[PDB]
Amino acid sequence: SMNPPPPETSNPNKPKRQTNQLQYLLRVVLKTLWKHQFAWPFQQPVDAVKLNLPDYYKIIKTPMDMGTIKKRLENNYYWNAQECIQDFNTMFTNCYIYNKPGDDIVLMAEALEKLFLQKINELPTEE
Ligand SMILES: CCOc1cc(-c2c(C)noc2C)cc([C@@H](C)O)c1
C-alpha cells in the first residue's frame, strides 16, 4: 500500500550522449504526448497512497511515467533511442496490466500510444 521510491532519473557514472534520435524523442515524442488532454495521469509516478490503490505496486514491478521520462531525456540519461522507447512501452503496458479494458485510464493510454506510434514511425535515421 506504500509508494516505492521513484525510478532513477540521474546516474552520474552512466555514460551519456546526445543523438538526433534522442533529441527527437524529447522535442517531438515527449512534447506531443505531454501536451495532450489525456497526459495528466501519466505526468508523474502513480501515487498509490493518494489514489488508494494499495495493490498497484504489488502488481507493477517496473513503474514508469512520463515525468520520469521527461527528466531522463532532459538529464541526457539515455545512451540510445531504444532505451527511451522501452520506457514509454513499459508505461503503457503497466496501465494495460493493472487496469481493465474500457477503463478511462486505458482509453487514455490507448490515445497516447497511438500518437506515440505515429511519431516513432518517423524517428529520424541516426546521423
Ligand atoms: C494523477 C493520477 O490520476 C489518475 C491515475 C489513474 C491510474 C493510472 C495512471 N494507472 O492506474 C490508474 C488507476 C487513473 C486515473 C483516472 C483516469 O481514472 C487518474
Tab-separated table of N, CA and C and ligand atoms in Angstrom:
chain	number	residue	atom	x	y	z
A	1	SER	N	0.813	-1.256	0.000
A	1	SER	CA	0.000	0.000	0.000
A	1	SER	C	0.821	1.269	0.000
A	2	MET	N	2.125	1.154	0.312
A	2	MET	CA	3.031	2.298	0.278
A	2	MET	C	3.611	2.512	-1.132
A	3	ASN	N	4.051	3.736	-1.380
A	3	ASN	CA	4.747	4.050	-2.629
A	3	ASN	C	6.210	3.658	-2.530
A	4	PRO	N	6.756	3.086	-3.612
A	4	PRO	CA	8.194	2.820	-3.738
A	4	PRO	C	8.923	4.128	-4.048
A	5	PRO	N	10.231	4.128	-3.858
A	5	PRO	CA	10.960	5.272	-4.410
A	5	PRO	C	10.761	5.336	-5.926
A	6	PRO	N	10.821	6.532	-6.501
A	6	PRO	CA	10.600	6.619	-7.934
A	6	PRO	C	11.777	6.067	-8.743
A	7	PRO	N	11.572	5.822	-10.057
A	7	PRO	CA	12.679	5.342	-10.851
A	7	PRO	C	13.812	6.383	-10.881
A	8	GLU	N	15.042	5.940	-11.039
A	8	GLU	CA	16.114	6.924	-11.114
A	8	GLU	C	16.041	7.770	-12.406
A	9	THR	N	16.382	9.044	-12.262
A	9	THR	CA	16.481	9.954	-13.406
A	9	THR	C	17.887	10.527	-13.593
A	10	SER	N	18.799	10.188	-12.685
A	10	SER	CA	20.168	10.643	-12.807
A	10	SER	C	21.107	9.578	-12.283
A	11	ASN	N	22.218	9.405	-12.978
A	11	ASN	CA	23.226	8.471	-12.557
A	11	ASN	C	24.516	8.980	-13.176
A	12	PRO	N	25.311	9.702	-12.397
A	12	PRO	CA	26.499	10.340	-12.989
A	12	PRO	C	27.522	9.427	-13.655
A	13	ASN	N	27.545	8.138	-13.287
A	13	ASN	CA	28.509	7.191	-13.856
A	13	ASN	C	28.009	6.468	-15.119
A	14	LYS	N	26.756	6.698	-15.485
A	14	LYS	CA	26.198	6.215	-16.746
A	14	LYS	C	26.733	7.102	-17.862
A	15	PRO	N	27.387	6.510	-18.886
A	15	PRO	CA	27.893	7.330	-19.973
A	15	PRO	C	26.708	7.952	-20.761
A	16	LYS	N	26.881	9.167	-21.275
A	16	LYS	CA	25.783	9.918	-21.921
A	16	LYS	C	26.133	10.356	-23.331
A	17	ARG	N	25.127	10.483	-24.184
A	17	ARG	CA	25.349	11.175	-25.437
A	17	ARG	C	24.048	11.800	-25.902
A	18	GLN	N	24.172	12.698	-26.849
A	18	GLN	CA	23.028	13.449	-27.318
A	18	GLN	C	22.912	13.159	-28.807
A	19	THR	N	22.027	12.222	-29.163
A	19	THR	CA	21.850	11.791	-30.547
A	19	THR	C	20.653	12.503	-31.181
A	20	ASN	N	20.610	12.565	-32.512
A	20	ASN	CA	19.446	13.172	-33.185
A	20	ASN	C	18.151	12.402	-32.858
A	21	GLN	N	18.228	11.084	-32.674
A	21	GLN	CA	17.051	10.312	-32.273
A	21	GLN	C	16.565	10.663	-30.865
A	22	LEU	N	17.499	10.854	-29.939
A	22	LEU	CA	17.118	11.214	-28.558
A	22	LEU	C	16.529	12.634	-28.525
A	23	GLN	N	17.079	13.533	-29.346
A	23	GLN	CA	16.581	14.894	-29.437
A	23	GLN	C	15.152	14.854	-29.962
A	24	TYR	N	14.898	13.981	-30.942
A	24	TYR	CA	13.530	13.783	-31.465
A	24	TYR	C	12.569	13.232	-30.402
A	25	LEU	N	13.056	12.267	-29.638
A	25	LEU	CA	12.257	11.693	-28.565
A	25	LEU	C	11.815	12.749	-27.558
A	26	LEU	N	12.658	13.751	-27.303
A	26	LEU	CA	12.261	14.865	-26.437
A	26	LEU	C	11.419	15.948	-27.133
A	27	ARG	N	11.909	16.442	-28.274
A	27	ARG	CA	11.338	17.610	-28.937
A	27	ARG	C	10.030	17.293	-29.671
A	28	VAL	N	9.899	16.046	-30.131
A	28	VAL	CA	8.713	15.610	-30.838
A	28	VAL	C	7.850	14.647	-30.000
A	29	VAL	N	8.402	13.525	-29.572
A	29	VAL	CA	7.566	12.474	-28.972
A	29	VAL	C	7.024	12.856	-27.617
A	30	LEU	N	7.921	13.203	-26.690
A	30	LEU	CA	7.518	13.556	-25.329
A	30	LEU	C	6.671	14.826	-25.371
A	31	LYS	N	7.117	15.827	-26.113
A	31	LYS	CA	6.368	17.096	-26.187
A	31	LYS	C	4.933	16.884	-26.668
A	32	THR	N	4.764	16.051	-27.685
A	32	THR	CA	3.416	15.774	-28.231
A	32	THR	C	2.509	15.083	-27.181
A	33	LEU	N	3.040	14.066	-26.478
A	33	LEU	CA	2.232	13.329	-25.502
A	33	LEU	C	1.957	14.155	-24.243
A	34	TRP	N	2.955	14.950	-23.840
A	34	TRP	CA	2.891	15.718	-22.605
A	34	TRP	C	1.799	16.803	-22.658
A	35	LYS	N	1.587	17.378	-23.845
A	35	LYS	CA	0.613	18.483	-24.035
A	35	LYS	C	-0.815	17.981	-24.235
A	36	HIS	N	-0.984	16.685	-24.415
A	36	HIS	CA	-2.268	16.095	-24.761
A	36	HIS	C	-3.237	16.217	-23.581
A	37	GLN	N	-4.512	16.290	-23.902
A	37	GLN	CA	-5.561	16.368	-22.891
A	37	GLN	C	-5.591	15.191	-21.937
A	38	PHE	N	-5.047	14.056	-22.368
A	38	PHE	CA	-5.040	12.826	-21.558
A	38	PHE	C	-3.690	12.562	-20.867
A	39	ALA	N	-2.768	13.519	-20.920
A	39	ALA	CA	-1.450	13.307	-20.378
A	39	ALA	C	-1.417	13.247	-18.849
A	40	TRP	N	-2.290	14.013	-18.189
A	40	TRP	CA	-2.139	14.281	-16.744
A	40	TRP	C	-1.925	13.048	-15.841
A	41	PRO	N	-2.702	11.975	-16.001
A	41	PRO	CA	-2.427	10.847	-15.093
A	41	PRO	C	-1.031	10.234	-15.202
A	42	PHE	N	-0.357	10.496	-16.338
A	42	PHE	CA	0.916	9.902	-16.705
A	42	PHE	C	2.109	10.877	-16.501
A	43	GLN	N	1.840	12.096	-16.030
A	43	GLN	CA	2.897	13.083	-15.905
A	43	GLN	C	3.764	12.931	-14.642
A	44	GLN	N	3.471	11.934	-13.792
A	44	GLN	CA	4.209	11.701	-12.520
A	44	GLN	C	3.987	10.225	-12.169
A	45	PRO	N	4.811	9.642	-11.292
A	45	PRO	CA	4.586	8.268	-10.807
A	45	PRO	C	3.181	8.071	-10.255
A	46	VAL	N	2.635	6.877	-10.411
A	46	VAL	CA	1.368	6.529	-9.754
A	46	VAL	C	1.531	6.678	-8.231
A	47	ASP	N	0.746	7.563	-7.628
A	47	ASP	CA	0.706	7.723	-6.171
A	47	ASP	C	-0.362	6.782	-5.629
A	48	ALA	N	0.081	5.585	-5.287
A	48	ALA	CA	-0.819	4.526	-4.837
A	48	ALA	C	-1.462	4.839	-3.496
A	49	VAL	N	-0.808	5.681	-2.698
A	49	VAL	CA	-1.418	6.147	-1.421
A	49	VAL	C	-2.585	7.122	-1.683
A	50	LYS	N	-2.313	8.191	-2.420
A	50	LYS	CA	-3.333	9.216	-2.662
A	50	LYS	C	-4.509	8.656	-3.482
A	51	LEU	N	-4.212	7.770	-4.436
A	51	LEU	CA	-5.207	7.132	-5.286
A	51	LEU	C	-5.915	5.938	-4.634
A	52	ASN	N	-5.480	5.576	-3.428
A	52	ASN	CA	-5.982	4.387	-2.742
A	52	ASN	C	-5.970	3.147	-3.673
A	53	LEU	N	-4.770	2.830	-4.157
A	53	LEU	CA	-4.545	1.656	-4.985
A	53	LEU	C	-3.491	0.819	-4.272
A	54	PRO	N	-3.870	0.205	-3.142
A	54	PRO	CA	-2.845	-0.394	-2.326
A	54	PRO	C	-2.155	-1.597	-2.948
A	55	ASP	N	-2.767	-2.192	-3.983
A	55	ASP	CA	-2.181	-3.314	-4.729
A	55	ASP	C	-1.438	-2.913	-6.028
A	56	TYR	N	-1.324	-1.612	-6.301
A	56	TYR	CA	-0.716	-1.149	-7.586
A	56	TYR	C	0.716	-1.729	-7.752
A	57	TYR	N	1.541	-1.457	-6.754
A	57	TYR	CA	2.952	-1.844	-6.751
A	57	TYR	C	3.187	-3.313	-6.323
A	58	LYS	N	2.119	-3.994	-5.899
A	58	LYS	CA	2.137	-5.469	-5.795
A	58	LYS	C	2.177	-6.093	-7.189
A	59	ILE	N	1.457	-5.451	-8.116
A	59	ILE	CA	1.310	-5.948	-9.481
A	59	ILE	C	2.353	-5.341	-10.436
A	60	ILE	N	2.661	-4.047	-10.277
A	60	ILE	CA	3.549	-3.355	-11.188
A	60	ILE	C	4.937	-3.221	-10.536
A	61	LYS	N	5.856	-4.052	-11.010
A	61	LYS	CA	7.251	-4.110	-10.539
A	61	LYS	C	8.253	-3.275	-11.310
A	62	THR	N	7.829	-2.714	-12.445
A	62	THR	CA	8.702	-1.844	-13.242
A	62	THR	C	7.911	-0.578	-13.571
A	63	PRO	N	7.701	0.293	-12.553
A	63	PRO	CA	6.902	1.521	-12.761
A	63	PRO	C	7.583	2.460	-13.755
A	64	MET	N	6.778	3.204	-14.493
A	64	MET	CA	7.278	4.187	-15.416
A	64	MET	C	6.164	5.175	-15.682
A	65	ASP	N	6.575	6.406	-15.893
A	65	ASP	CA	5.660	7.513	-16.159
A	65	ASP	C	6.374	8.553	-17.006
A	66	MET	N	5.632	9.504	-17.589
A	66	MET	CA	6.268	10.499	-18.447
A	66	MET	C	7.077	11.560	-17.694
A	67	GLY	N	6.721	11.857	-16.437
A	67	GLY	CA	7.541	12.735	-15.608
A	67	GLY	C	8.975	12.211	-15.530
A	68	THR	N	9.085	10.921	-15.251
A	68	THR	CA	10.377	10.230	-15.217
A	68	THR	C	11.079	10.257	-16.583
A	69	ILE	N	10.332	9.935	-17.625
A	69	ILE	CA	10.873	10.003	-18.984
A	69	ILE	C	11.362	11.405	-19.336
A	70	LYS	N	10.555	12.418	-19.008
A	70	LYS	CA	10.896	13.795	-19.282
A	70	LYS	C	12.202	14.156	-18.597
A	71	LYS	N	12.321	13.798	-17.318
A	71	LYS	CA	13.565	14.099	-16.566
A	71	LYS	C	14.764	13.349	-17.141
A	72	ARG	N	14.563	12.073	-17.469
A	72	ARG	CA	15.610	11.266	-18.114
A	72	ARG	C	16.121	11.922	-19.416
A	73	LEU	N	15.203	12.368	-20.266
A	73	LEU	CA	15.595	12.998	-21.523
A	73	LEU	C	16.312	14.349	-21.279
A	74	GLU	N	15.730	15.172	-20.408
A	74	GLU	CA	16.316	16.471	-20.007
A	74	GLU	C	17.693	16.362	-19.324
A	75	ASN	N	17.948	15.240	-18.647
A	75	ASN	CA	19.233	14.948	-17.996
A	75	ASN	C	20.174	14.104	-18.865
A	76	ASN	N	19.815	13.876	-20.131
A	76	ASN	CA	20.580	13.039	-21.050
A	76	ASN	C	20.870	11.666	-20.463
A	77	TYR	N	19.881	11.102	-19.770
A	77	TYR	CA	20.066	9.857	-19.037
A	77	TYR	C	20.335	8.682	-19.932
A	78	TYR	N	19.804	8.737	-21.158
A	78	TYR	CA	19.833	7.626	-22.091
A	78	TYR	C	21.101	7.630	-22.969
A	79	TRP	N	21.519	6.424	-23.345
A	79	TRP	CA	22.515	6.232	-24.398
A	79	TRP	C	21.894	6.140	-25.768
A	80	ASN	N	20.727	5.496	-25.878
A	80	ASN	CA	20.110	5.300	-27.178
A	80	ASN	C	18.585	5.466	-27.145
A	81	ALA	N	17.999	5.593	-28.330
A	81	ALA	CA	16.563	5.787	-28.508
A	81	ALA	C	15.763	4.610	-27.968
A	82	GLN	N	16.279	3.402	-28.170
A	82	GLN	CA	15.571	2.166	-27.763
A	82	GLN	C	15.265	2.131	-26.246
A	83	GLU	N	16.197	2.652	-25.450
A	83	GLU	CA	16.004	2.679	-24.007
A	83	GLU	C	14.837	3.577	-23.617
A	84	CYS	N	14.712	4.716	-24.287
A	84	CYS	CA	13.622	5.654	-24.054
A	84	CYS	C	12.286	5.122	-24.571
A	85	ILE	N	12.300	4.581	-25.789
A	85	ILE	CA	11.136	3.886	-26.359
A	85	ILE	C	10.632	2.764	-25.409
A	86	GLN	N	11.538	1.994	-24.838
A	86	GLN	CA	11.158	0.948	-23.896
A	86	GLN	C	10.447	1.552	-22.665
A	87	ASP	N	10.958	2.673	-22.141
A	87	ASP	CA	10.279	3.359	-21.034
A	87	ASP	C	8.814	3.700	-21.378
A	88	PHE	N	8.565	4.242	-22.581
A	88	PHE	CA	7.200	4.594	-22.957
A	88	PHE	C	6.382	3.305	-23.033
A	89	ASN	N	6.945	2.266	-23.642
A	89	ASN	CA	6.202	0.987	-23.734
A	89	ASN	C	5.914	0.331	-22.376
A	90	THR	N	6.867	0.430	-21.459
A	90	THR	CA	6.634	-0.003	-20.079
A	90	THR	C	5.456	0.762	-19.448
A	91	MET	N	5.417	2.070	-19.674
A	91	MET	CA	4.373	2.929	-19.123
A	91	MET	C	3.007	2.437	-19.611
A	92	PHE	N	2.890	2.235	-20.908
A	92	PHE	CA	1.620	1.798	-21.485
A	92	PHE	C	1.229	0.430	-20.990
A	93	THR	N	2.186	-0.482	-21.007
A	93	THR	CA	1.938	-1.855	-20.615
A	93	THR	C	1.507	-1.970	-19.160
A	94	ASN	N	2.142	-1.213	-18.279
A	94	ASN	CA	1.732	-1.142	-16.852
A	94	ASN	C	0.272	-0.785	-16.701
A	95	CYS	N	-0.157	0.191	-17.501
A	95	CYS	CA	-1.513	0.671	-17.445
A	95	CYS	C	-2.437	-0.443	-17.893
A	96	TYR	N	-2.065	-1.122	-18.981
A	96	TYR	CA	-2.878	-2.255	-19.501
A	96	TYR	C	-2.928	-3.446	-18.563
A	97	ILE	N	-1.816	-3.742	-17.873
A	97	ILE	CA	-1.741	-4.823	-16.924
A	97	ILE	C	-2.642	-4.559	-15.717
A	98	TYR	N	-2.528	-3.362	-15.150
A	98	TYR	CA	-3.179	-3.057	-13.870
A	98	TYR	C	-4.683	-2.875	-14.051
A	99	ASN	N	-5.062	-2.247	-15.159
A	99	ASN	CA	-6.425	-1.832	-15.400
A	99	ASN	C	-7.211	-2.813	-16.275
A	100	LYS	N	-8.453	-2.454	-16.577
A	100	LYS	CA	-9.386	-3.307	-17.314
A	100	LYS	C	-9.754	-2.649	-18.634
A	101	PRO	N	-10.074	-3.477	-19.638
A	101	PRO	CA	-10.449	-2.883	-20.909
A	101	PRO	C	-11.622	-1.913	-20.737
A	102	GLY	N	-11.548	-0.803	-21.459
A	102	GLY	CA	-12.601	0.193	-21.397
A	102	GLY	C	-12.576	1.120	-20.198
A	103	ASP	N	-11.711	0.866	-19.205
A	103	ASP	CA	-11.470	1.858	-18.123
A	103	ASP	C	-10.999	3.150	-18.775
A	104	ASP	N	-11.390	4.277	-18.186
A	104	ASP	CA	-10.913	5.594	-18.643
A	104	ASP	C	-9.405	5.653	-18.866
A	105	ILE	N	-8.624	5.185	-17.893
A	105	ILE	CA	-7.178	5.308	-17.994
A	105	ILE	C	-6.609	4.510	-19.207
A	106	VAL	N	-7.254	3.376	-19.505
A	106	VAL	CA	-6.883	2.514	-20.636
A	106	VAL	C	-7.207	3.210	-21.954
A	107	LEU	N	-8.372	3.851	-22.069
A	107	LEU	CA	-8.700	4.653	-23.250
A	107	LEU	C	-7.690	5.807	-23.467
A	108	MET	N	-7.261	6.424	-22.357
A	108	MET	CA	-6.280	7.495	-22.367
A	108	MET	C	-4.922	6.995	-22.849
A	109	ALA	N	-4.454	5.919	-22.238
A	109	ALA	CA	-3.209	5.239	-22.666
A	109	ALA	C	-3.258	4.903	-24.154
A	110	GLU	N	-4.400	4.372	-24.600
A	110	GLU	CA	-4.562	3.963	-25.995
A	110	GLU	C	-4.416	5.149	-26.946
A	111	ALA	N	-4.997	6.295	-26.580
A	111	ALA	CA	-4.906	7.508	-27.369
A	111	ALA	C	-3.480	8.019	-27.432
A	112	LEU	N	-2.825	8.033	-26.281
A	112	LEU	CA	-1.414	8.459	-26.243
A	112	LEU	C	-0.514	7.498	-26.988
A	113	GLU	N	-0.790	6.204	-26.873
A	113	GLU	CA	0.037	5.198	-27.509
A	113	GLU	C	-0.095	5.285	-29.029
A	114	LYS	N	-1.286	5.640	-29.521
A	114	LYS	CA	-1.488	5.786	-30.970
A	114	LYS	C	-0.618	6.915	-31.504
A	115	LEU	N	-0.614	8.040	-30.793
A	115	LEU	CA	0.243	9.178	-31.147
A	115	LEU	C	1.718	8.828	-31.022
A	116	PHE	N	2.090	8.170	-29.926
A	116	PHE	CA	3.450	7.627	-29.762
A	116	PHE	C	3.897	6.838	-31.006
A	117	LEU	N	3.082	5.877	-31.409
A	117	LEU	CA	3.404	5.029	-32.550
A	117	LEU	C	3.563	5.834	-33.846
A	118	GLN	N	2.683	6.807	-34.061
A	118	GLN	CA	2.767	7.665	-35.240
A	118	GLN	C	4.087	8.401	-35.260
A	119	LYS	N	4.489	8.916	-34.101
A	119	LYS	CA	5.765	9.648	-34.012
A	119	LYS	C	6.995	8.762	-34.159
A	120	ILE	N	7.001	7.604	-33.514
A	120	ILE	CA	8.142	6.682	-33.568
A	120	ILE	C	8.283	6.146	-34.988
A	121	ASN	N	7.164	6.088	-35.709
A	121	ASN	CA	7.194	5.626	-37.102
A	121	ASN	C	8.074	6.546	-37.969
A	122	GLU	N	8.185	7.825	-37.580
A	122	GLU	CA	9.033	8.802	-38.276
A	122	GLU	C	10.312	9.181	-37.497
A	123	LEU	N	10.766	8.297	-36.612
A	123	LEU	CA	12.027	8.506	-35.909
A	123	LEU	C	13.135	8.700	-36.972
A	124	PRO	N	13.938	9.771	-36.837
A	124	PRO	CA	14.936	10.019	-37.869
A	124	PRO	C	16.060	8.998	-37.862
A	125	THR	N	16.717	8.883	-39.009
A	125	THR	CA	17.847	7.993	-39.137
A	125	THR	C	18.971	8.599	-38.300
A	126	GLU	N	19.666	7.753	-37.553
A	126	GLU	CA	20.800	8.191	-36.766
A	126	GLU	C	21.851	8.803	-37.710
A	127	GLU	N	22.379	9.973	-37.353
A	127	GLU	CA	23.277	10.712	-38.264
A	127	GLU	C	24.749	10.670	-37.835
B	1	LIG	C1	-2.897	11.607	-11.032
B	1	LIG	C2	-3.221	10.182	-11.464
B	1	LIG	O1	-4.619	10.180	-11.851
B	1	LIG	C3	-5.081	9.000	-12.332
B	1	LIG	C4	-4.391	7.783	-12.341
B	1	LIG	C5	-5.003	6.641	-12.854
B	1	LIG	C6	-4.311	5.415	-12.955
B	1	LIG	C7	-3.072	5.233	-13.601
B	1	LIG	C8	-2.140	6.245	-14.243
B	1	LIG	N1	-2.706	3.951	-13.608
B	1	LIG	O2	-3.736	3.246	-12.978
B	1	LIG	C9	-4.714	4.127	-12.600
B	1	LIG	C10	-5.989	3.691	-11.864
B	1	LIG	C11	-6.311	6.720	-13.386
B	1	LIG	C12	-6.988	7.947	-13.391
B	1	LIG	C13	-8.411	8.217	-13.937
B	1	LIG	C14	-8.326	8.492	-15.424
B	1	LIG	O3	-9.374	7.210	-13.703
B	1	LIG	C15	-6.358	9.056	-12.854
